[PDB]
Design a protein around this ligand. Structure first.
Ligand code: HEM
Length: 464
């Protein structure tokens, strides 16, 4: 038991119970716990996830020192998450140079020039979402944002990973959908993951038993699909899509994306860009619906830059600001990641405090984003916060929805754009208003994922 590392170092935090540590404080969730700790221990506090020392930091200087300055040196890797298998080669799970290699191979794929060429396909499904959303609205019943924005998200990373173009909302059985739909996020407060962190000696046992957190049935299916797709369709001789950009690169520093690595990167891109988007999109619509003044002002801004339901364009989106403000403000209130984690690879000292080796440095994003010491009425949805004549009053190391430094969200530009394209056409064709079932105020889940307690159902009316 390392339970006492923190007070020997003079770092405050909750009293750890043997073996369990401080996991029984996650009964409320990662978010509530972090904020209770932040108020009851000030800037720095240390807790034990089983027997893993976790040190929380809230100093913009120290966050920059961890996320940016000493990234490649000390704070490169994230914490091991469980039996991963071949998916160990996915950028998100990769560690040290092996990561640094992959990052460089993929850095181009997520360039504005590539994104701008992908807009046509993303916008195509903007219409598919609208046409789909139309029906349910006219039908005269409340709409499950979870389902429609889920189908939109799905039709995206799927379609920008080769031309398997699908209306998942109308094809709930397309195997390709059936499999990819299981690529949801991990509730790390689920008995299993909780059991794994108290008993990390089990991860090796599960690995030789060929048990993997990523459902094999899905992993294999794609591992076959990607291979058939990489040959059967495009070695007759291409479409602008992550896969193609990955196949194009393979055949021209460290390079040579292993056929299996390519699959792993593809799988992690839907894992990182499926429920993430579907969740944020729904959160925005709730905030817009609950604040009609914002929804109109946004609907107006769109109609101005795009006269008469004018097709959304790349350059056009960059212009729209109030939209960027609404998106950025919804992210402040709902940082889906909740926490930004880096492992201390060696014994180091940063701006004063000393960090032992093998300690997980945690940036409580949710807590920072809602810290009254940086935010006026933090529980208020005030887009104005992110005005051109205010943003310079926002520390980038406090507002970290996509993280920061060399290991930030590589698909940040894509995710923002992808959400913007939808919101624009969605608001262009419809208006969202509180329903009888609409839960106000919105109650967040006590689990290990930043989701609503009850699914967001709202009334959709087609303005003319
Ligand atoms: C609203 C949408 C999204 C949000 C809020 C989001 C947020 C995040 C955050 C907070 C991280 C961790 C950054 C850190 O540790 O400092 C991350 C990592 C990552 N995200 Fe996203 N993300 C989003 C969408 C996407 C999409 C669409 C993709 C890919 C298509 C993607 C790919 C990744 C990858 C690969 C990483 C790991 C990067 C690395 O290890 O170098 N994300 N994301």
């Amino acid at each position: 038991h390392s339970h006492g590392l923190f007070k020997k170092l003079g770092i405050p935090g909750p009293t750890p119970l043997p073996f369990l540590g401080n996991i029984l404080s996650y009964h409320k969730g990662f978010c509530m716990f972090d904020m209770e700790c932040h108020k009851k221990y000030g800037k720095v506090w240390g807790f034990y996830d089983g027997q893993q020392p976790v040190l929380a930091i809230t100093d913009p200087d120290m966050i920059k020192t961890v996320l940016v300055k000493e990234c490649y040196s000390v704070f490169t890797n994230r914490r091991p998450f469980g039996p991963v298998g071949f998916m160990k080669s996915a950028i998100s799970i990769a560690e040290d140079e092996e990561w640094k290699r992959l990052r460089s191979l993929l850095s181009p794929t997520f360039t504005s020039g590539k994104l701008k060429e992908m807009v046509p396909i993303i916008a195509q499904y903007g219409d598919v979402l609208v046409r789909n959303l139309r029906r349910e609205a006219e039908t005269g019943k409340p709409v499950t944002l979870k389902d429609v924005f889920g189908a939109y998200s799905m039709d995206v990373i799927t379609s920008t990973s080769f031309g398997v173009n699908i209306d998942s909302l109308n094809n709930p059985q397309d195997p390709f959908v059936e499999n990819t739909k299981k690529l949801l996020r991990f509730d790390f407060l689920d008995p299993f993951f909780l059991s794994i962190t108290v008993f990390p000696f089990l991860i090796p046992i599960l690995e030789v038993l060929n048990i993997c957190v990523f459902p094999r049935e899905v992993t294999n299916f794609l591992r076959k699909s990607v291979k058939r797709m990489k040959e059967s369709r495009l070695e007759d001789t291409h479409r602008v899509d992550f896969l193609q950009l990955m196949i194009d690169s393979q055949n021209s520093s460290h390079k040579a994306l292993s056929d299996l690595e390519l699959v792993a990167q593809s799988i992690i891109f839907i894992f990182a860009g499926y429920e993430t988007t579907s969740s944020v999109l729904s959160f925005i619509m709730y905030e817009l619906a609950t604040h009609p003044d914002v929804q109109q002002k946004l609907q107006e801004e769109i109609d101005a830059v795009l006269p008469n339901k004018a097709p959304p364009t790349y350059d056009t989106v960059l212009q729209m600001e109030y939209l960027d403000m609404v998106v950025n403000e919804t992210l402040r209130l709902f940082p889906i990641a909740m926490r930004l984690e880096r492992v201390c690879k060696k014994d180091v000292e940063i701006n004063g405090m000393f960090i032992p080796k093998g300690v997980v440095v945690m940036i409580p994003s949710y807590a920072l984003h809602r810290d009254p010491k940086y935010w006026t009425e933090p529980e208020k949805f005030l887009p104005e916060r992110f005005s051109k004549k205010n943003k310079d009053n926002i520390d980038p190391y406090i507002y970290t929805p996509f993280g920061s430094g060399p290991r930030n969200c590589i698909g940040m530009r894509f995710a923002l754009m992808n959400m913007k394209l939808a919101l624009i056409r969605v608001l262009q064709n419809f208006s969202f208003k509180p329903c009888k079932e609409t839960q106000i105020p919105l109650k967040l889940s006590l689990g290990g994922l930043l989701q609503p307690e009850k699914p967001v159902v709202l009334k959709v009316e087609s303005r003319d």
